[PDB]
Design a protein around this ligand. Structure first.
Ligand SMILES: CCCCCCCCCCCCCCCCCC(=O)OC[C@H](COP(=O)([O-])OCC(O)COP(=O)([O-])OC[C@@H](COC(=O)CCCCCCCCCCCCCCCCC)OC(=O)CCCCCCCCCCCCCCCCC)OC(=O)CCCCCCCCCCCCCCCCC
Ligand SMILES: CCCCCCCCCCC(CCCCCCCCCC)(CO[C@H]1O[C@@H](CO)[C@H](O[C@@H]2O[C@@H](CO)[C@H](O)[C@@H](O)[C@@H]2O)[C@@H](O)[C@@H]1O)CO[C@H]1O[C@@H](CO)[C@H](O[C@@H]2O[C@@H](CO)[C@H](O)[C@@H](O)[C@@H]2O)[C@@H](O)[C@H]1O
Ligand SMILES: CCCCCCCCCCCCCCCCCC(=O)OC[C@H](COP(=O)(O)OCCN)OC(=O)CCCCCCCCCCCCCCCCC
Ligand SMILES: CCCCCCCCCCCCCCCCCC(=O)OC[C@H](COP(=O)(O)OCCN)OC(=O)CCCCCCCCCCCCCCCCC
Lengths: 179, 92
């Protein structure tokens, strides 16, 4: 089915990557600047970039792996919880409570909308319309995604929708027949 | 006999060295003269690899037209330049 994650291993890999991105962005901030700057103002007038990269990396991957491990499935919700943790780390830099709540909620919603579309910038090859079976079914078969039919099985309607509202396993007519 | 072995590597080192005197030279036209030296190191490498024709095409075209154009610009025009101070490039 699935495979659980190594939260400590993926977290320390991301911590090293965020440390590296912080050093690169601090050097790019020195060299693209004005005023008296030296070799030691890399981490002095840094603007706190290495804290941004480090905290965002560790929080997103730790909350993503922990939420994927306690739910025992991988879907778009884990990106929502991880993006909420990222928004918590980015929103604590502005030391205000309603700001913080806004950063958490909106960053979590944006990352959940990201992770629900596949969590990929690029395309998936087998899932797109162009590389998948489309059009009508040629004979009767299990109608896969992207396919059209004329008539659907009623057993599927009872299994997917329910046995309730106006919906029945037998139409209301021949359930009421004279013999 | 094996004194003639490391020539290519020597030119590589020599070419490396020449670029540091291009980007760091107090006078401009002295650094453009170091660039002329770098064309000569290139033509050494092109003879050394087996392309003796190109080496003289580089000395004809790059040294004798493009560098002459550059020196000819720097003469009768005004260019300010600052020295390689440690304080301005230690941030880089
Ligand atoms: C275009 C996208 C539009 C869709 C979103 C609609 C806008 C939402 C509202 C925005 C807003 O209110 O901002 C106000 C706020 C106004 O600034 P301000 O002048 O300092 O404060 C005055 C306000 O009145 C603040 O004072 P206040 O007391 O009145 O309000 C507190 C709080 C109030 O804001 C709220 O709305 C919170 C209340 C909502 C609760 C509702 C609960 C029920 C639902 O205001 C904030 O500080 C909000 C900061 C959170 C900004 C969220 C940006 C999300 C990134 C969008 C990605 C695209 O905007 C900002 O703070 C700008 C911050 C800098 C821009 C950040 C952009 C960086 C994006 C980084 C990437 C993030 C991840 C992306 C996904 C990655 C994977 C793909
Ligand atoms: C208009 C409001 C905004 C709505 C935004 C749309 C985004 C909604 C996306 C839904 C959708 C595109 C359809 C959209 C088309 C209309 C687009 C509308 C406009 C677009 C702007 C992307 O579905 C994505 O869902 C994500 C989670 O929900 C998954 O995340 C990831 O999970 C991990 C998994 O490996 C990743 O490892 C991980 O990296 C991610 O975490 C992705 O796997 C998946 O690609 C569905 O695509 C998919 O659906 C499945 C069904 O199950 C289909 O399988 C079919 O069914 C089976 C037999 O029945 C058989 O398997 C198969 O034989 C058959 O093929 C596929 O064919 C496929 O096509
Ligand atoms: C060791 C290996 C592990 C570490 C490897 C990680 C590498 C990550 C490198 C990222 C470094 C951050 C980029 C950067 O330095 O940006 C700084 C530069 C100017 O920004 P600055 O002047 O400092 O701040 C002013 C704010 N107005 O900003 C720039 O203008 C640079 C242009 C952006 C850098 C290119 C990135 C392209 C991708 C854009 C992301 C779009 C995401 C879409 C979703
Ligand atoms: C005018 C302006 C119009 C703006 C319209 C709103 C634009 C979007 C705003 C931001 C919405 C953020 C959505 C967060 C949802 C995050 C998420 O991961 O949803 C996953 C969820 C499950 O999808 P799946 O992975 O396939 O699992 C199947 C389990 N039944 O997928 C779902 O079940 C659907 C959850 C989204 C429900 C609708 C959200 C509002 C639209």
């Amino acid at each position: 089915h699935f495979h659980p994650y190594n939260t400590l291993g993926l977290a320390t890999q991301s911590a090293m990557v965020g440390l590296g991105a912080g050093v690169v962005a601090a050097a790019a901030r020195n060299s693209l600047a004005t005023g008296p700057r030296n070799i030691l103002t890399t981490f002095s007038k840094s603007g706190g970039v290495v804290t941004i990269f480090t905290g965002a990396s560790i929080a997103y991957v730790f909350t993503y792996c922990s939420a994927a491990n306690l739910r025992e499935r991988k879907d778009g919700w884990n990106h929502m919880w991880a993006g909420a943790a990222t928004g918590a780390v980015l929103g604590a830099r502005t030391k205000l409570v309603p700001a913080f709540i806004g950063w958490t909620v909106l960053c979590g919603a944006a990352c959940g909308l990201f992770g629900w579309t596949g969590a990929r910038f690029n395309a998936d090859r087998k899932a797109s319309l162009e590389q998948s079976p489309k059009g009508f079914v040629q004979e009767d078969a299990h109608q896969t995604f992207w396919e059209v039919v004329h008539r659907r099985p009623l057993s599927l309607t009872v299994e997917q929708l329910g046995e309730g509202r106006g919906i029945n396993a037998v139409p209301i007519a021949t359930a009421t027949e004279a013999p | 006999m094996y004194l003639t072995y490391y020539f290519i590597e020597i030119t590589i080192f020599l070419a490396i060295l020449c670029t540091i005197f291009i980007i760091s030279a107090k006078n401009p036209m002295v650094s453009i003269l170091y660039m002329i030296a770098l064309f000569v190191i290139a033509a050494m490498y092109l003879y050394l690899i087996g392309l003796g024709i190109f080496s003289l095409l580089y000395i004809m075209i790059y040294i004798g037209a493009i560098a002459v154009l550059f020196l000819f610009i720097i003469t009768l025009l005004d260019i300010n330049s600052t020295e390689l101070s440690v304080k301005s490039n230690i941030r880089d």
